[PDB]
Structure 1
Amino acid sequence: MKYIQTEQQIEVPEGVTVSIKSRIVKVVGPRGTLTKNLKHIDVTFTKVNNQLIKVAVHNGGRKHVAALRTVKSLVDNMITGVTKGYKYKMRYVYAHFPINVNIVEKDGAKFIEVRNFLGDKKIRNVPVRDGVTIEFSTNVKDEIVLSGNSVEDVSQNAADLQQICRVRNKDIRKFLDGIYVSHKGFITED
């Protein structure tokens, strides 16, 4: 159809500074800073009143309009991550062999290492990405908490830890053993 003008609102809270040179977005709030290259979308950012940023598509088809709300969600995730952060909580699900998840140093490269997953002799290793903080819960058993500003990094590192512990050659409606995301929320939220 080629809609003439489609436009999304982006609400900036008070402690957040957003600098958008051409389509490279830098979001600087209290937790730190984040940058996203958006030069694959062809949208137009503008600033209204230092708390509101419009993003708009002009003469855009159905898919080009679809990518605009995606752009709004990406910049909102940047703002939410540098204001509140993200916190993904995973649980260890096992039947007989207790999954042993430790965090270890190998040449300064900060690995999560998983032992005894279904009684395996194979040590699994998931590198902690930059920004992601790993800690282990107290008073909640079998809980590993991945935290950070970047929801991309926290979610992908939690997904790496889930995919590294998938069951081979067994009925997986019965062999449920694994590490699973149980909670997605924020670092500092109430």
Structure 2
Amino acid sequence: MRYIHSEETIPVPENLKVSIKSRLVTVEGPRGKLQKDLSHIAVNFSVVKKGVIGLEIHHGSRKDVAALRTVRTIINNMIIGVTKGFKYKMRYVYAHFPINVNVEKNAETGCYEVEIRNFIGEKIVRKVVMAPGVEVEISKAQKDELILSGNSLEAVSQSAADIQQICKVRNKDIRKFLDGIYVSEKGNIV
């Protein structure tokens, strides 16, 4: 119906710095630095108060304002990632064959490689490479569990889904064979 004005607002913590270019958003804080391009959506970025940023659409449609709700939550997710970070706790279970998980970090390309061995007795090794900026550890707080943490929620979640998908059972009974690596807890580091 061509709404004349629709506005959205994102608040910012004291200990963060947001530098926003034409449509590049860069956020700095205690945990690190995250950058993302939003050049595919029409928006005017603005300042309305000391610690709140503003997002607006003039002469737009409901699709346009719906983009403005997604653009906010994405920027809010980046702010939360740089303030507190993101963390996924995953657990691997088995019935007869212990799943052996080896986590290492290569000097080249600076990424974390997770190797899965003995998944229901398979002799094949399953190697998964993490997105950059993701730390993977086998924490000695509970057994048969892994912690995958980082700054970017998208990267952390995609990595967790990558392990979950690579440990998938084929040509078996879903109700009978209960082996895999599953995301158990979702949250923030702090």
TM-score by length of 1: 0.93
Q: 1:169 aligns with which of 164, 168, 171?
A: 171
Q: 2:112 aligns with which of 110, 121, 145?
A: 110
Change (3 A) 1:8 1:154: same
Report deviation, 1:105. Answer: 5.2
User: Any idea what SS the aligned residue of 1:95 has?
Assistant: coil
User: Any idea what SS the aligned residue of 2:142 has?
Assistant: coil
User: Any idea what SS the aligned residue of 1:155 has?
Assistant: helix
Distance 1:107 1:175 in 2: 37
Q: 2:155 aligns with which of 127, 139, 153?
A: 153
Partner of 2:122: 120
Instruction: Report the AA paired with residue 36 of structure 1.
Output: K
Instruction: Report the AA paired with residue 6 of structure 2.
Output: T
Distance 2:128 2:176 in 1: 25
Is the CA contact 2:5–2:56 (under 8 Å) kept in the aligned structure 1? Answer: yes
Larger displacement relative to structure 2 (133-142 or 151-160):
133-142
User: Any idea what SS the aligned residue of 1:156 has?
Assistant: helix
Matches within 5 A, 1:91-110: 91-104=91-104, 108=108, 109-110=111-112
User: Any idea what SS the aligned residue of 1:64 has?
Assistant: helix
Matches within 5 A, 1:51-130: 51-104=51-104, 108=108, 109-130=111-132
RMSD between aligned residues: 1.4
Change (3 A) 1:7 1:182: same
Distance 2:102 2:41 in 1: 40
Report deviation, 1:107. Answer: 7.2
Distance 2:105 2:80 in 1: 30
Q: Does 1:46 align with 2:46?
A: yes
* Structure 1, gaps ≥5 residues long: none
Report deviation, 1:95. Answer: 2.0
Matches within 5 A, 1:13-24: 13-24=13-24
TM-score by length of 2: 0.93
Distance 2:49 2:79 in 1: 17
Partner of 2:187: 185
* Structure 2, gaps ≥5 residues long: none
Distance 1:98 1:3 in 2: 59
| CA deviation string 1:101-140 (max 9, x = no partner) | 1113567353100000111111001002210001112121
| CA deviation string 1:17-52 (max 9, x = no partner) | 111111100001111110000001111111122310
Structure 1 runs of 4+ aligned residues shifted over 3 Å read 104-110
What percentage of aligned pairs have identical amino acids?
A: 61
Report deviation, 1:57. Answer: 1.6
